[PDB]
Amino acid sequence: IHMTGPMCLIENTNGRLMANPEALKILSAITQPMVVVAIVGLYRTGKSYLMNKLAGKHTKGIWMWCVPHPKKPGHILVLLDTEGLGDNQNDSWIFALAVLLSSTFVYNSIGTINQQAMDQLYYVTELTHRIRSKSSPEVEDSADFVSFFPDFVWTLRDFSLDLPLTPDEYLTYSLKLKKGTSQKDETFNLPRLCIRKFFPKKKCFVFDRPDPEFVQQVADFCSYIFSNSKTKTLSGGIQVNGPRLESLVLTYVNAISSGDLPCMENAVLALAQIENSAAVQKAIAHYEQQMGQKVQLPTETLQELLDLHRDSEREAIEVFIRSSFKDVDHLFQKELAAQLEKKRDDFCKQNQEASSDRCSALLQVIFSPLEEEVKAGIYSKPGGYRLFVQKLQDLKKKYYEEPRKGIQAEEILQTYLKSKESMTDAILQTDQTLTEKEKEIEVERVKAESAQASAKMLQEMQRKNEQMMEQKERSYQEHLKQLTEKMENDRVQLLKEQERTLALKLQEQEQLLKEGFQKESRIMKNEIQDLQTKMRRRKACTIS
Ligand SMILES: *C/C=C(\C)CC/C=C(\C)CCC=C(C)C
């Protein structure tokens, strides 16, 4: 994707914030990961020039300009521009939204970092009231800000002043706090503490008055943005692309419209709702496909059908596990298991009925010649019983010899062989070539054969009774095995992010202590203690 000019992403019309549904349409189509650079500043600050230079070349709100990334292959550079800041009831909301949506946050101001510049940057002192970190109900929620806030860049335009001092050390010294307790001191320290604690990284660029040395001060700012601005990522390594950014815009803007707080965790869970249900359908579609191309529905045994389900079920779970995240209480995985169980019971009852048709059909083919040779009285005769017993067994052999009958072959036949039991005993009793005590022996031999066969059917209806419950356990163990490995990867990734956060907090805490601010160091030490406790957490399995 390569838009020629910026399009309004969020409009500030009527005191309302609305996401331009056209802008979301373009976002949904972008599949590549995104580096989101937000350029923020009061109106007529010169942001439009940085916006055009990063791209490679109204009415209030946030404007978006997505061009391909110049120095990262296969990535999209998303430029966000705040239009109309300081002209005012939604100004602070636009500042907050630019923090939530960007991976690098560029604040642009004119002149130097004095009292007027800090007063104009009053939005940072309201982020505690505009942004929420955690969804769930003694440290502040804003202590989590540093773990997902963007890098901070403060560009100073028309910086007519001599630094020896680097632009970065100028920022560092400017953010040093004042000692004292009067409120001009607390007013002085509040935006500086906010910048130092909420953003993981700080950078400063100074620009002369606009020129070939204004052009390569700009060119070095762009190259720093191109080399150092990271992919927009949500907690858990989720790389934000088009549809995922659209998810964020909608969640945050709808939360503001409702009078609620845009909450980073709520946005992640709302996005997980979308992709997890899509993961379930992708999992099912893979199951149906690998199954329809692997089962021919007179299965020889039941275990042949259960093994095809088991192997198809394993891959479907693999599909879902790969495409899912934040499956709180495993609701979507349990939903996938329910649908896979429903599919398994449908393949089974269609399996047995394809067998109860292949065999019931071949009874009318094999045994109806004999059935109507009995009709014409062909066996009603001296010696007719032995001729009948012999031909019935030849037919029974021809029945067992047919290729693939299924799991119903014995039940269908033994039901028919007893359908004609009295018809056979009539042939036996009227045969005049047989002893009447040899008639005795044969009535015993037949009812022993019937009782033996009628017991092995009940023995098989038990073996299949228990193959089903047995496979129900491997299914469960397969879900358990794959979820366990998924939950460990997520924990290892969450721990990697928390160690990074722990290092940034420890660095800022003792820096505060070194500068002599025991109160602020004490607060940060509690944030560290709260974070180290959280790092020891392990998510549980919802079994019942
Ligand atoms: C550690 C996780 C456990 C013990 C739960 C794993 C089970 C599911 C997820 C549910 C899927 C399995 C069935 C519905 C039988």
Residue numbers in the entry: 5 to 61, 74 to 103, 109 to 158, 164 to 189, 195 to 241, 259 to 592
Provide the authors' own sentences about this structure as they appear in the paper:
The guanylate-binding proteins (GBPs) play critical roles in cell-autonomous immunity against a diverse range of bacterial, viral, and protozoan pathogens. GBP1 contains an N-terminal large GTPase (LG) domain and a C-terminal helical region, which can be further divided into a middle domain (MD) that contains the α7-α11 helices and a GTPase effector domain (GED) that consists of the α12-α13 helices. The GED folds back and interacts with LG and MD, which is important to maintain GBP1 at the resting state. Recent studies have discovered that IpaH9.8 ubiquitinates and degrades a subset of GBPs, which is important for S. flexneri to suppress host defense and replicate in the cells.
GBP1 is farnesylated at Cys589, and this modification is important for its localization to the Golgi apparatus and recruitment by various pathogens. We subsequently determined the crystal structure of GBP1F. Interpretable electron density is present for the farnesyl group, as well as the entire C-terminal tail of GBP1. The farnesyl group is accommodated in a pocket formed by His378, Gln381, Lys382, Ala385 from the α9 helix and Tyr524, His527, Leu528, Leu531 from the α12 helix. These interactions pull the α12 helix towards the α9 helix, and cause the GED domain to become more tightly fastened to the rest of the protein. In this conformation, the α7 helix remains bent; while the N-terminal half the α12 helix, as well as the majority of the MD domain, undergoes a ~10° rotation when compared to the previously determined full-length GBP1 structure. In a way, the GBP1F structure likely reflects GBP1 at its most tense state. By creating additional interactions between the GED domain and the MD domain, the farnesyl group appears to function as the second tier of bolt to lock the GED domain to the rest of the protein. A bending of the α7 helix is forced in this conformation.
